Design a protein around this ligand. Structure first.
Ligand SMILES: OC[C@H]1O[C@H](O[C@H]2[C@H](O)[C@@H](O)[C@@H](O[C@H]3[C@H](O)[C@@H](O)[C@@H](O[C@H]4[C@H](O)[C@@H](O)[C@@H](O[C@H]5[C@H](O)[C@@H](O)[C@@H](O)O[C@@H]5CO)O[C@@H]4CO)O[C@@H]3CO)O[C@@H]2CO)[C@H](O)[C@@H](O)[C@@H]1O
Ligand SMILES: OC[C@H]1O[C@H](O[C@H]2[C@H](O)[C@@H](O)[C@@H](O[C@H]3[C@H](O)[C@@H](O)[C@@H](O)O[C@@H]3CO)O[C@@H]2CO)[C@H](O)[C@@H](O)[C@@H]1O
Ligand SMILES: OC[C@H]1O[C@H](O)[C@H](O)[C@@H](O)[C@@H]1O
Ligand SMILES: OC[C@H]1O[C@H](O)[C@H](O)[C@@H](O)[C@@H]1O
Ligand SMILES: [Ca+2]
Ligand SMILES: [Ca+2]
Ligand SMILES: [Ca+2]
Ligand code: NA
Length: 481
């Protein structure tokens, strides 16, 4: 009940290989703050040492083999990582490992491959005849040999690439030619077929590939003792594959692994399709909510706050929604930059942390800051919201998203939690107040703002109503503390 997930990394973390240790020694602190699950960054060897991990080179090298010019990953060695997991396990925190199965970058060598170019804006249309290119599709893993796995990757294990080493032409997408070669399906339909994204695109139609990735999922789960996954770029991956992959792993390990997929599209329709196609066997990040939050932080008070939840996954399918404010892609400078402004950030964290629907997530970047880009640590403002979730956010919810600026909602609390119950009120504009029902058994109680933004108190009247207030462009969470 009331769990809180935390993405434990940001894109511009320093390449000092001491991240696993930071996580190791921060376990006790996080669990006390209300964090119940940590989603760790790619644990495997990328195309280089300072690769964030998405340039997935070898999924069996968790900072254990000398490859790509280093033994450790950007975050550390395999032993440091496992010492980190142990620390989290001892503090009763679950561990979610990231998962990159859409592609493989940093190949060991090139191969001559027959292929055709396709239209970047419609990968279903071949724009050239068949011809030979030089693609980075060969993986032998010199530093690992056959340790853990003997599987070797070759061009026929992929559907295509975006780079021909023999000509070095820009803005090209190459679809490989051969027996049964075609972009995968089903996948997102933007650009005709969105199977191809970057690097060497893995072919989910090849049985050896499916078999291998499933086997790796199990090895990866048992090796680290993972409690779940954060699956990368699922809109570019065959939907049925991901579904059956997750099922395979849950079955082969006897664990009901939690799974949150990143279907990055600001479209609920597309996301619902993915959910239906994957038989609802796992959750998805609420990308639309993130954009609603972002757009609101950018409207200077003119966002109609009554709609903050329109078109969002948490509103339509709350059981399958992992709600977040920001991540490594939305942070400053990144490809999908859409950073929720600082002033609005705490309102955004109250919207995800104090409501009963959705599985909330805290971003490392917002919590500890992103010094390279001037983002201050906001844990001092997030901690109060975390405590409200851990101790107060329980019981029946009564919404009050009935004003273009000032919206709010209360939680009546339940006996399972001593003194539970809260009244969240926020304004993206001018301050004010709002009468809200918190429960008749609360009559006479004297409530205070756990964020400390408002210093007074609110006395619940004999009928269960309290007249709560909030400052402009701010959030207040009144509880019976
Ligand atoms: O430097 C010599 C190098 O040569 C060989 O490397 C080659 C690669 O193996 C080969 O795959 C190819 O790599 C290309 C890649 O195909 C191409 O897609 C591009 O990669 C970009 C993405 O396009 C871009 O979207 C971005 O992706 C990020 C994303 O922004 C972020 O949101 C998140 O999802 O993480 C993603 C991964 O970081 O960035 C990547 C990388 O900038 O460019 C690649 C080349 O830079 O071509 C390489 C040769 O040029 C050898 O294998 C290697 O050992 C040698 O070091
Ligand atoms: O974090 C520890 C906890 O995580 C997992 O539970 C999460 C669910 O997987 C996830 O679906 C979500 O469930 C809540 C819904 O989102 C919400 O709309 C409402 O229906 O309440 C649900 C929970 O009561 O969030 C939970 C975490 O609260 C995992 O399954 C647990 O085993 C693990 O202990
Ligand atoms: O190039 C040799 C062989 O490579 C791969 O196995 C192809 O799938 C196959 O069609 C081809 O004959
Ligand atoms: O388990 C299947 C069900 O999961 C969730 O409750 C969805 O909201 C619902 O649409 C779906 O039918
Ligand atoms: Ca294919
Ligand atoms: Ca793909
Ligand atoms: Ca407004
Ligand atoms: Na593919």
């Amino acid at each position: 009940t009331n769990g809180t997930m935390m993405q434990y990394f940001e894109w511009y973390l320093p390449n000092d290989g001491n991240h696993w240790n930071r996580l190791n020694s921060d376990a006790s602190n996080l669990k006390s703050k209300g964090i119940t699950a940590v989603w760790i960054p790619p644990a495997w060897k990328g195309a280089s040492q300072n690769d964030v991990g998405y340039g997935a080179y070898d999924l069996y090298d968790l900072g254990e083999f000398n490859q790509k010019g280093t033994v450790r990953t950007k975050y550390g060695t395999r032993s440091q990582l496992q010492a980190a997991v142990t620390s989290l396990k001892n503090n009763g925190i679950q561990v979610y490992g990231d998962v990159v199965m859409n592609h493989k970058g940093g190949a060991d060598a090139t191969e001559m491959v027959r292929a055709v170019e396709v239209n970047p804006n419609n990968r279903n249309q071949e724009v050239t005849g068949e011809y030979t290119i030089e693609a980075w599709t060969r993986f032998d893993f010199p530093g690992r040999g056959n340790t853990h796995s003997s599987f070797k990757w070759r061009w026929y294990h992929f559907d295509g690439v975006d780079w021909d080493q023999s000509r070095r032409l820009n803005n090209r997408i190459y679809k490989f030619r051969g027996h049964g070669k075609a972009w995968d399906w089903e996948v997102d339909t933007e650009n005709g077929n969105y199977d191809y994204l970057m690097y060497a695109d893995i072919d989910m139609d090849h049985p050896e590939v499916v078999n291998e990735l499933r086997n790796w999922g199990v090895w990866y789960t048992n090796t680290l003792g993972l409690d779940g996954f954060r699956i990368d770029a699922v809109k570019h991956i065959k939907y049925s594959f991901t579904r059956d992959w997750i099922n395979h792993v849950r079955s082969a390990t006897g664990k009901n692994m939690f799974a949150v997929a990143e279907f990055w599209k600001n479209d609920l329709g597309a996301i619902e399709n993915y959910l239906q196609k994957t038989n609802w066997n796992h959750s998805v990040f609420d990308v639309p909510l993130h954009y609603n939050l972002y757009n609101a932080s950018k409207s200077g008070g003119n966002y109609d706050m009554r709609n903050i939840f329109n078109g969002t996954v948490v509103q339509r399918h709350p059981s399958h929604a992992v709600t977040f404010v920001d991540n490594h892609d939305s942070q400053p400078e990144e490809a999908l930059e859409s950073f929720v402004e600082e002033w609005f950030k705490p309102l955004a964290y109250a919207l995800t942390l104090t409501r009963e629907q959705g599985y909330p997530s805290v971003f490392y970047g917002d919590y500890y800051g992103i010094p390279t880009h001037g983002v201050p640590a906001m844990r001092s403002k997030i901690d109060p919201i975390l405590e409200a979730r851990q101790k107060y956010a329980y019981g029946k919810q009564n919404d009050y998203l009935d004003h273009h600026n000032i919206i709010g909602w209360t939680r009546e609390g339940n006996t399972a939690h001593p003194n539970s119950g809260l009244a969240t009120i926020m304004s993206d504009g001018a301050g004010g107040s709002k009468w809200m029902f918190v429960g008749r058994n609360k009559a006479g109680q004297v409530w205070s703002d756990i964020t400390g933004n408002r210093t007074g108190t609110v006395t619940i009247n004999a009928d269960g109503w309290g007249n709560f207030s909030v400052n402009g462009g701010s959030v207040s969470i009144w509880v019976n503390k």
